Amino acid sequence: IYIIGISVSLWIGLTILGLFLNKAVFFSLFVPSGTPLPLVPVLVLIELLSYTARAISLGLRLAANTLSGHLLMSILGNLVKIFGLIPLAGIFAIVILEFAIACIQAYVFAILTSSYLKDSIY
Amino acid sequence: ILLVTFLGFIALISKTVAPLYGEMAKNRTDHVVGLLNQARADHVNAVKTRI
Amino acid sequence: MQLVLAAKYIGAAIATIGLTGAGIGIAIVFAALINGTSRNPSLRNTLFPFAILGFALSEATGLFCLMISFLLL
Amino acid sequence: MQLVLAAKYIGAAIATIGLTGAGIGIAIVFAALINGTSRNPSLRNTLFPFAILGFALSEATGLFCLMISFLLL
Amino acid sequence: MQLVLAAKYIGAAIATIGLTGAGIGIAIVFAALINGTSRNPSLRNTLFPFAILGFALSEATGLFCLMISFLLLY
Amino acid sequence: QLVLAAKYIGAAIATIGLTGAGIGIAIVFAALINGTSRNPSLRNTLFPFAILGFALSEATGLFCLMISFLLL
Amino acid sequence: LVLAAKYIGAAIATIGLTGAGIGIAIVFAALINGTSRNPSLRNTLFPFAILGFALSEATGLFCLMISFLLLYG
């Protein structure tokens, strides 16, 4: 699941960069705020470079959720050796936060794609 | 954690069942009330035009 | 051999230093949303969509930094 | 295995540096909720739901960083 | 022993670096409660219950980090 | 031996820059959530500066991650 | 051995990214909060944000060239 998540996220990042480059062949380009200054081409850490960082951050949700569930093996040996009822409440809160993180990660990926489509048509 | 997740999701699905039926009343049940009000207004307009 | 195995345990310790920015970032967005909701009337939607989307962007640094320490251990 | 045994004890100590961000996050979310409730009248629900959900997101960094130091012992 | 014994003493000192977040957390919750109580009249309960419950959550990070340094020295 | 053991240390201390990139996304979101409740910067206006400001603040984390990934 | 110390120069030099990452958000927080007070929209505050961000990002570009030069020359 970890290797399939990084491979699926890399294909979505290449499609976002290819769609923005195809629209620049008939609607100018620029994409730079000018305010009586220069050195705007050196800070090209967005658009093309931003797709690589957004794909690794969105694809890491599958690996982070598996790390929380795999951490119960270290707490299972100590609870079967204070009362052990504190581990049940902590595992229930981490499972609810991991399931709710999938909806927040899906909304963050759709919000990032809306900025690329709106800037390519302006 | 498997038994705690099944018990917590059972209580959340029970409260969501009442919320889904109540939220559907403003769209599904509201369509029947809107169609009945439109049919009553069309019947009064047809009776006034026939008179 | 022996030097490469000892560096794997220390590589996962210093890489977890980024949890201070990701942990405090989840509370910085929640502090402004709780204090701003009582000022009327950013409750339903409007500011609710930016709080859910802003929390996932701030927490992305902790998930990316955790993959480096997990790959070296 | 002399170098790997000494690195396991040092790896669990430097990995606990992330508790500063998780510990201060529980107080940052509680400071805005206590000062915002006195403005009338964010008490029942409204701001009470965001404080409980916001504290769980900030505490996730402390629980995730503690599993790294516990697995190396 | 030798290498493992020297790493146990140094591990109890580096693990105590997390006390800065737990120590400053008790003052951050007390500063908002003292400044907010002057607006009249959050005294009994209300603000006193959130300050007592909020201080226990911030102190959980320091108590959990102290058990790691204490287990390596004993 | 010495070059292989130094590769693990080259990716551990290099990830310390995530504190600036992680807290930067929350600093721009705190001013945007508190400013939107003052009426009525919703569509565009303040939304364009918050979307463009979040990508510039996240550029530091992408450059620091490429250094740790190249040595590991 | 010079190859062992060359890898450490590219990791400890990245500690300066905290000032460049937080500086881009500090200038954006004052510009977003000041534009909602009517009516610093066209130019004025928008033109100073592009020039002000280049001064804060100059420290991160100079510090990144030091660690990149040790890994190649």
Name the residue in chain D with its Cα closest to that of E73: D9
CB contact under 8 A, F61 and A53: yes
CB contact under 8 A, C24 and D58: yes
CB pairs under 8 A between F and G: 138
Q: How far apart are CA B31 and CA B37, in angstroms?
A: 10
Structural biology method used: cryo-EM
Tell me the backbone φ, ψ of residue D38, rounded to 5 degrees: -80, 0
Closest CA to C4 of E19, F2, A112, A16: F2
Name the residue in chain D with its Cα closest to that of E57: D26
CB contact under 8 A, G51 and A35: yes
Q: What 3-state DSSP class applies to A9?
A: helix
Q: What angle do CA A116, C24, D10 make, to 5 degrees?
A: 115
Q: Are D60 and A104 in contact (CB under 8 A)?
A: no
Residue partners of C48: CB distance under 8 A and separation at least 6: C42
Contacts of A90 in chain D (CB under 8 A): 63
Tell me the structure's resolution in angstroms, rounded to a single decimal: 7.0
Q: Are C71 and A64 in contact (CB under 8 A)?
A: no
Q: Are C48 and D48 in contact (CB under 8 A)?
A: no
Distance from CA of C57 to the nearest CA of D (A): 13
Residue with tokens 């140094």: E10
What CA–CA distances, in Å, run from F5 to B17, C39, D43, D71, G59?
58, 56, 56, 22, 30
Q: Are G13 and F16 in contact (CB under 8 A)?
A: no
Closest CA to A62 of A110, A13, A6: A6
Residue partners of A20: CB distance under 8 A and separation at least 6: A47, A116, A120
Select the residue of D56, D57, D64 nearest A68 (Cβ to Cβ): D64
Strand ranges inside B1-51, DSSP E: none
Q: How many CB atoms lie within 10 A of CB C40?
A: 9
- Any idea what DSSP says for residue D40? S
Select the residue of A43, A53, A115 nearest F58 (Cβ to Cβ): A53
In this complex, the chains that touch C, judged by 3 or more CB pairs closer than 8 A, are: A, D, F
CB contact under 8 A, G51 and A42: no
CB contact under 8 A, D34 and E17: no
- By the 10 Å C-beta count (0-12 exposed, 13-18 middle, 19+ buried), A77 is classed as exposed
Which residue type, as a one-letter code, is found at position D24?
A: I
